[PDB]
Scaffold this active site. Structure first.
Site, PDB file in Angstrom:
ATOM      1  N   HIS A  42      -2.277  -5.157   6.264  1.00 25.60           N
ATOM      2  CA  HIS A  42      -0.968  -5.306   6.942  1.00 25.60           C
ATOM      3  C   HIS A  42      -0.753  -6.749   7.415  1.00 25.60           C
ATOM      4  CE1 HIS A  42       0.258  -1.032   7.082  1.00 25.60           C
ATOM      5  NE2 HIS A  42      -0.992  -0.724   7.370  1.00 25.60           N
ATOM      6  N   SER A 110      -0.976   1.672   2.318  1.00 18.69           N
ATOM      7  CA  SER A 110      -0.322   2.073   3.559  1.00 18.69           C
ATOM      8  C   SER A 110       1.094   1.557   3.622  1.00 18.69           C
ATOM      9  CB  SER A 110      -1.113   1.556   4.759  1.00 18.69           C
ATOM     10  OG  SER A 110      -1.139   2.513   5.823  1.00 18.69           O
ATOM     11  N   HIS A 119       6.592  -3.212   4.264  1.00 17.78           N
ATOM     12  CA  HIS A 119       5.527  -3.642   3.370  1.00 17.78           C
ATOM     13  C   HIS A 119       4.492  -2.545   3.125  1.00 17.78           C
ATOM     14  CE1 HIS A 119       2.140  -4.382   6.217  1.00 17.78           C
ATOM     15  NE2 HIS A 119       3.123  -4.057   7.027  1.00 17.78           N
TER      16      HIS A 119
END
EC number: 3.4.21.97
Lengths: 211, 211
Positions: A42, A110, A119
């Site tokens: 992330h 994810s 994203h």
């Protein structure tokens, strides 16, 4: 030399509360306005490719993306010991060795939904239930192993990909920080148990039965 | 602020062929001429402390070492997510947080015997059978949890430690390369299954019953 990753962002219902993604959300959300990126952990400062297409499957959102980052293969290759891969590989693997490393280190995806999306993160295992992914070196191969995904669906992605210009774009991150983001996914996952068993079943749920 | 690590380099017989260490070897080997060092991943360029003493136990060689490397805690701390450790830790842990990270990331020790020794490696799990280790912030605490180790033995190490001058020496490695050696132990261990179960039983074998 790029890698194509394909998998379900989420399985309708199954992923559970909050995380739960549903049709009112999907359909509204796509086609996504902003070209959705793929980063690791992330890390906004660590993007290594971009989702080239997302469709809506009977089972859930299914995506395809491109991970074309020369550094991502270099740092990993360096990390592997002098004998990761026997000589039985010498006489057979080239960039498939990058693919072998990246698939086992970062098996899941994810979807940091904003509501709709933001994203896609690569990681060990995700919060959602069918989030295991497949990587390969051609779009039709990343998606080839999902036994449930309709040929009608597989077809649709493959076309959208053909439109997609920018399949040259090489994402550059920097070994020094890449080795830190990749070290960060290990540290922050050391305690997880039945790691491969979790990934075993998320795989079966996605339809990656392949074998 | 240092960490003391203590554990068995090898259990007489149990570790199996080749790797097998025996008394004719131990007794000959100690007291070791060259001050034995502790590095990570067997990386000669990545030493972070030094074995301050090794004795010979009824069960096998038992050692104590010092890991005093300021960088080793900094890179890990950085790697841990903003929420590794709740607030229940805020209100209680200081450098014990370094210790918590290092114990779970690098639980085992590998004695790269030359015949007799060379260096002790920190790693996930070692080739040998009782190679799980304990880390703490005082020599008598690293060894405190081995339920089988005689008080007579525990005593002996503790004294040898008192001699040991140089308990100030701070091993400096460099975050950039440290993050690579530490990333390298993850990559080269991603495929191992029942990781914590293996470490569960190596722990029980060493006598670390503590609880």
């Amino acid at each position: 030399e790029a890698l194509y990753v394909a998998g379900y962002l989420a399985l309708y219902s199954k992923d559970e509360g909050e995380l739960n993604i549903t049709p009112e959300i999907v359909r509204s959300a796509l086609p996504p306005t902003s070209k959705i990126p793929i980063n690791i952990d992330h890390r906004k400062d660590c993007v290594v490719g971009e989702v080239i297409a997302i469709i809506e499957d009977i089972r859930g959102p299914f995506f395809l993306g491109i991970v074309r980052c020369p550094q991502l293969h270099a740092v990993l290759f360096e990390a592997a010991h002098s004998n990761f891969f026997g000589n039985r590989d010498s006489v057979l693997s080239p960039l498939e060795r990058a693919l072998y490393l990246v698939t086992n280190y970062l098996p899941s995806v994810s979807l940091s939904s904003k509501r709709l999306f933001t994203h896609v993160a690569l990681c060990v295992v995700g919060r959602r239930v069918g989030t295991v992914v497949n990587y390969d070196c051609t779009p039709e191969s990343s998606i080839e192993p999902f036994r449930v995904l309709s040929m009608e669906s597989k077809a649709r992605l493959l076309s959208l990909v053909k439109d997609y210009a920018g399949l040259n774009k090489v994402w550059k991150v920097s070994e020094d920080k890449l080795a830190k983001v990749l070290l960060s996914t290990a540290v922050n996952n050391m305690l997880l148990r039945d790691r491969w068993d979790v990934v075993a079943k998320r795989r079966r749920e996605a339809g990656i039965m392949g074998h």
